[PDB]
Amino acid sequence: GIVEQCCTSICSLYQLENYCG
Amino acid sequence: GIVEQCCTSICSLYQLENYCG
Amino acid sequence: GIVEQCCTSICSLYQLENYCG
Amino acid sequence: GIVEQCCTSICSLYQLENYCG
Amino acid sequence: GIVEQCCTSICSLYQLENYCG
Amino acid sequence: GIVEQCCTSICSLYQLENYCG
Amino acid sequence: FVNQHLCGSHLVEALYLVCGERGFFYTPK
Amino acid sequence: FVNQHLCGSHLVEALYLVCGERGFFYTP
Amino acid sequence: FVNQHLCGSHLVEALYLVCGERGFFYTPK
Amino acid sequence: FVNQHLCGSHLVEALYLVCGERGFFYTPK
Amino acid sequence: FVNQHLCGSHLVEALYLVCGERGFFYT
Amino acid sequence: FVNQHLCGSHLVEALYLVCGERGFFYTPK
Ligand SMILES: [Ca+2]
Ligand SMILES: [Ca+2]
Ligand SMILES: [Ca+2]
Ligand SMILES: [Cl-]
Ligand SMILES: [Cl-]
Ligand SMILES: [Zn+2]
Ligand SMILES: [Zn+2]
């Protein structure tokens, strides 16, 4: 999940766009 | 859509819960 | 206070409503 | 009323301070 | 300024990147 | 800098004002 | 489109808060 | 009015910073 | 410290939505 | 769960800004 | 007036995410 | 560290509120 990946380590914006619909 | 319903008039917490998963 | 009760453990929306005026 | 005074015009810090405890 | 450019019309992510250090 | 000073101990508004332009 | 963008930013925060664990899906027009 | 509702949301955030430990009572 | 200062910022925002017309009073004490 | 909740609030804002008109799925657990 | 001030608050938040390590200017 | 990242997000909000029209130049440094 996004919480597991991005709440202990910083996620870049291009990493976050992978979760877009 | 949620935009057309809650961005011209105030929606309560109960109206917004209809868009839950 | 609300900090010692909701920042050490998660508070629900019902528990937050206790502090409404 | 803080909404009527500060949502029709910009309120500075001193005007905002008057609503503290 | 950025306010006159991006608060009268929506600016894209690339347009915001113009103001980065 | 700002992060190393105001993210390990809280900073007042007067301390933050010194970082204004 | 400025107002709708500002409203949408507050809607997603409210959806995150009021919905908690069920999750939500947000989409514009 | 949503714009007034959104302005109130930012007002309490500003009240939180300025007031600090004295606190505040958002009446509206 | 910093952790609870950040938590309180989200707390008052949550109280603003939940309480609504009734309002609320915040005290870190 | 305090840190997870605070982290999730910013991720939702970040997803809203990045995805834009595409939208995004959110599911805590 | 008020609307510009509210929009500016979201601008800096957007600048913080986009710019990252580079930082940003707000004038 | 995510907590440092989240803390900086609140710093720019406070800087915007305090500096106002004078502006500011944020740097993580
Ligand atoms: Ca917020
Ligand atoms: Ca905020
Ligand atoms: Ca925000
Ligand atoms: Cl807004
Ligand atoms: Cl936070
Ligand atoms: Zn806003
Ligand atoms: Zn936060």
Side-chain angles (χ1 to χ4, degrees), chain A, chain B, chain C, chain D, chain E, chain F, chain G, chain H residues 1-24 26-28, chain I residues 2-24 26-29, chain J, chain K, chain L:
Chain A
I2 180 178
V3 177
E4 307 276 31
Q5 188 188 15
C6 303
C7 290
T8 55
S9 176
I10 296 180
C11 283
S12 63
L13 288 194
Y14 58 84
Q15 283 185 283
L16 294 177
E17 76 169 353
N18 193 26
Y19 290 90
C20 303
Chain B
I2 184 178
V3 178
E4 292 78 20
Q5 176 63 217
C6 300
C7 291
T8 182
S9 186
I10 301 181
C11 288
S12 52
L13 305 173
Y14 299 85
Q15 311 182 235
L16 290 172
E17 199 170 1
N18 291 325
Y19 303 102
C20 272
Chain C
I2 193 179
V3 175
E4 301 91 39
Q5 281 212 310
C6 297
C7 294
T8 59
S9 60
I10 268 296
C11 281
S12 67
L13 299 190
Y14 173 73
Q15 293 170 333
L16 292 178
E17 198 183 1
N18 176 82
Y19 298 93
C20 303
Chain D
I2 184 178
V3 171
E4 288 76 8
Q5 183 187 352
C6 297
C7 290
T8 58
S9 59
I10 302 177
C11 279
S12 63
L13 298 188
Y14 181 81
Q15 307 172 242
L16 201 68
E17 171 236 330
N18 293 322
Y19 294 101
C20 301
Chain E
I2 184 178
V3 178
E4 291 79 9
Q5 282 284 350
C6 300
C7 292
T8 57
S9 60
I10 270 191
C11 290
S12 66
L13 283 300
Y14 171 79
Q15 290 178 328
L16 264 288
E17 207 174 6
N18 173 78
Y19 298 90
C20 298
Chain F
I2 176 70
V3 181
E4 298 82 31
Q5 177 190 346
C6 299
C7 291
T8 54
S9 59
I10 72 108
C11 283
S12 56
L13 304 177
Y14 306 98
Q15 291 162 323
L16 297 173
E17 190 186 23
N18 293 331
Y19 293 94
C20 298
Chain G
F1 283 168
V2 179
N3 278 22
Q4 286 193 357
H5 182 81
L6 296 181
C7 175
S9 185
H10 280 275
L11 283 180
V12 299
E13 285 188 327
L15 289 172
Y16 175 78
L17 183 67
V18 73
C19 206
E21 297 80 9
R22 301 169 49 186
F24 64 94
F25 176 71
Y26 181 87
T27 173
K29 176 181 298 181
Chain H
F1 297 92
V2 174
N3 65 335
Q4 171 171 323
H5 182 263
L6 302 184
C7 170
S9 181
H10 281 277
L11 273 182
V12 301
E13 288 184 317
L15 285 173
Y16 174 82
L17 305 178
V18 170
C19 299
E21 300 180 12
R22 282 180 300 167
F24 58 94
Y26 181 77
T27 296
Chain I
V2 177
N3 57 348
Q4 298 171 330
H5 182 92
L6 303 181
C7 165
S9 180
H10 287 263
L11 218 43
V12 297
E13 183 156 348
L15 294 179
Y16 174 80
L17 298 174
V18 171
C19 301
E21 308 84 357
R22 295 168 294 184
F24 64 96
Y26 181 71
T27 47
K29 40 215 174 181
Chain J
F1 299 97
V2 179
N3 283 16
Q4 271 187 330
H5 179 75
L6 298 185
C7 171
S9 58
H10 286 267
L11 284 175
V12 166
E13 278 184 335
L15 289 176
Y16 171 76
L17 189 68
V18 172
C19 303
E21 52 186 354
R22 296 162 54 189
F24 60 95
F25 290 129
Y26 188 75
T27 301
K29 237 191 176 186
Chain K
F1 283 159
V2 174
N3 203 89
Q4 290 190 0
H5 174 67
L6 299 184
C7 167
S9 178
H10 289 260
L11 279 183
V12 300
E13 295 176 338
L15 284 163
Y16 174 80
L17 289 173
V18 172
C19 300
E21 294 279 352
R22 298 172 294 181
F24 60 93
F25 296 87
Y26 186 80
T27 54
Chain L
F1 299 98
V2 173
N3 59 346
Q4 271 203 350
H5 178 84
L6 303 180
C7 169
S9 180
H10 283 265
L11 283 176
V12 298
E13 282 186 297
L15 286 182
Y16 171 80
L17 207 279
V18 166
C19 307
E21 86 187 57
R22 302 122 72 188
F24 61 95
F25 176 40
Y26 176 79
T27 44
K29 195 183 180 65

